[PDB]
Amino acid sequence: QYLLPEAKAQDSDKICVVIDLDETLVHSSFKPVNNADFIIPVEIDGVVHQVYVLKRPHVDEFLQRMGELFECVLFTASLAKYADPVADLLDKWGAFRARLFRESCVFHRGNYVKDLSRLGRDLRRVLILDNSPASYVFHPDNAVPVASWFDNMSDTELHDLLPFFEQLSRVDDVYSVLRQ
Ligand SMILES: COCCCOc1ccnc(C[S@@](=O)c2nc3ccccc3[nH]2)c1C
Ligand SMILES: [Mg+2]
């Protein structure tokens, strides 16, 4: 059975957007970072290591606005033990109606593929936002490309992507804009 429960009533009419974490919304690292947005302690084989998390610019405006426009789902290749605490801390608005992690990805030809068909949502109303063209090899026509973000604090891509999602949020069939 499908990766998601049935949409709640607030969410059923909306387009479902699958959103990536790392290098899409945040960039985390084991190397200490000086003025970090948050620091997550992560237990790895019994030893706690600090993870230094930087937020991509305009991520707050971005997530609060997508949480309105869409049934937003976090879908990352990372492990819950790291991604859940990052989410609790980023997601100030209850934007993510679900969280999917490494076990929900398909490992295909050495890549973590987000298989939109296991989602349980009509595919004409599913979008995937990911820095990584491989996570959507199976659904290239459901995808909004975004560049990988590491630390460039002049980045404006989340802000610049918003009027396009504003338009997508209203169509009956995303393929009518993307093209399948
Ligand atoms: C001591 O290093 C061993 C790493 C074990 O993996 C873990 C475990 C917990 N947390 C993290 C933090 S995160 O930066 C991260 N992003 C990733 C993207 C792809 C694959 C693994 C990833 N891991 C990682 C990478
Ligand atoms: Mg990524």
Range of the domain at 34: 1-180
Distance CA(86)–CA(45), nearest Å, equals 20
Cβ within 8 Å of residue 150, ≥6 positions away: 23, 27
Question: Nearest residue CA, atom 16 of ligand 1?
Answer: 78
CATH number, domain at 179? Answer: 3.40.50.1000
How was this structure determined? It was done by X-ray
20 flagged as catalytic: yes
Indicate the number of domains in the chain.
1
What is 143-160 written as a DSSP string?
Answer: EEE----SS-TT--HHHH
Question: For residue 36, how far is its CA from the centre of ligand 2 (angstroms)?
Answer: 19
> Which residues contribute to the annotated binding site?
20, 22, 131
Question: For residue 8, how far is its CA from the centre of ligand 1 (angstroms)?
Answer: 32
Residue 75 pairs with which residues in a beta bridge? Answer: 100
Q: For a pocket test of ligand 1, which of 76, 78, 113 has the largest count of ligand atoms closer than 8 A to its C-beta?
A: 78
The four Cα atoms 172, 174, 175, 177 give a dihedral, to 10 degrees, of: 100
Residue 44 pairs with which residues in a beta bridge? Answer: 47
**CB burial class (10 A; 0-12, 13-18, 19+) of residue 116?**
buried
Sheet holding 96-100, edge to edge: 96-100, 71-75, 16-19, 126-130, 143-145
Question: Nearest residue CA, atom 1 of ligand 1?
Answer: 44
- What is the resolution in angstroms? 2.3
